[PDB]
């Protein structure tokens, strides 16, 4: 009736597959490292497969509705997600009702194909105040969490700013905010059921060597 978290052994292609997309999609942001910390690597501590019967039905049902509406193409993609509510999401699923609505963002649940971008949001908008214990946005101690999810994009509406809206334009099912002078892409959905929390990644950002 709940979520069963299955551990993937590091020696499995799947575990290697997930950590590679994580580690390789890192980049350097204009932030100066202020939001997500200064690092050029992650120490991956754990990768778990999230299993919830209900969650994948809700997810599959919505995915059929979108295919219906998209000339039978649901346009699913594997994207990263970061926010301070990861533990609620793996048990209750994604929820559009907890979704901000203004400031720089709006009405949606954001996803990124860059893991370093989803990391900026682990502790909050901009990094919040950092970790609960040392109020440091660049902690190398505390274990952070992020999700590598299945996201049904459907017909995506492409534009430059997202803070904008609260639902998707007519005929579309997602919004891709793209780069101007943003830096990287951001995928937004306005329905929780259009995304399934496939993998739970437990990790730390590593401190640069020398
Ligand atoms: C900026 C925002 C709109 O972009 C997102 O993708 N956000 C977001 C926030 C919450 C969720 C979410 O699904 N939350 C929750 C789901 C289920 C139970 C919950 C219980 C308490 C809090 N959130 C819960 C999803 C996306 C937002 C958000 C807000 C704050 C920090 C990072 C991200
Ligand atoms: Zn800390």
Could you walk me through the main structural features you see in this protein, from its secondary elements to its overall organization?
The chain is of the alpha+beta class and 210 residues long. It has a single domain (1-210), classed as Phosphoenolpyruvate Carboxykinase, domain 3, CATH 3.90.228.10. Helices cover 20% and strands 26% of the residues. The protein has helices at 13-24, 53-68, 86-92, 115-120, and strands at residues 4-7, 42-51, 76-81, 109-111, 144-152, 156-159, 174-177, 186-189, 195-205. It has a 5-stranded antiparallel sheet, with helices on both faces. Strand 7 (174-177) and strand 8 (186-189) form a beta hairpin. The chain is globular and about 55 Å long. The N and C termini lie far apart (49 Å). Zinc ion binds next to loops.
Globally, the shape reads globular
Structural class assignment: alpha+beta
Helix-strand sequence: EHEHEHEHEEEEE
Q: What summary fits the major beta sheet?
A: 5 strands, antiparallel
Question: What's the CATH C level?
Answer: Alpha Beta
- Please tell me the CATH architecture by its name: Alpha-Beta Complex
Using DSSP, what is the number of strands?
Answer: 9
Rg from alpha-carbon coordinates:
17 Å
Protein name: Poly [ADP-ribose] polymerase tankyrase-1
Family: Belongs to the ARTD/PARP family.
Binding site for Zn(2+): 131, 134, 139, 142
Domain PARP catalytic: 9-209
């Amino acid at each position: 009736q709940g979520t069963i978290l299955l551990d993937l052994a590091p020696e499995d292609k799947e575990y290697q597959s997930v950590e590679e997309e994580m580690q390789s999609t890192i980049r350097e942001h204009r932030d100066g490292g202020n939001a997500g910390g200064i690092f050029n690597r992650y120490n991956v501590i754990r990768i778990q497969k999230v299993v919830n019967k209900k969650l994948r039905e809700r997810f599959c049902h919505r995915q059929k509705e979108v295919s219906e509406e998209n000339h039978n193409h649901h346009n699913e993609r594997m994207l990263f997600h970061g926010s301070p509510f990861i533990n609620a999401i793996i048990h209750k699923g994604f929820d559009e009702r907890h979704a901000y609505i203004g400031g720089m963002f709006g009405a949606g649940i954001y996803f990124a194909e860059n893991s370093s971008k989803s990391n900026q949001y682990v502790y909050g908008i901009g990094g919040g105040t950092g970790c609960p214990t040392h109020k440091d946005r660049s902690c190398y101690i505390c274990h952070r969490q992020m999700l590598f999810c299945r996201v049904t994009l459907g017909k995506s509406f492409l534009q430059f700013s997202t803070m904008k809206m609260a639902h998707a334009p007519p005929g579309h099912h997602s919004v891709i905010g793209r780069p101007s002078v943003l830096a990287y892409a951001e995928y937004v959905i306005y329905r929780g059921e259009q995304a399934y929390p496939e993998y739970l990644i437990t990790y730390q950002i590593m401190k640069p060597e020398h």
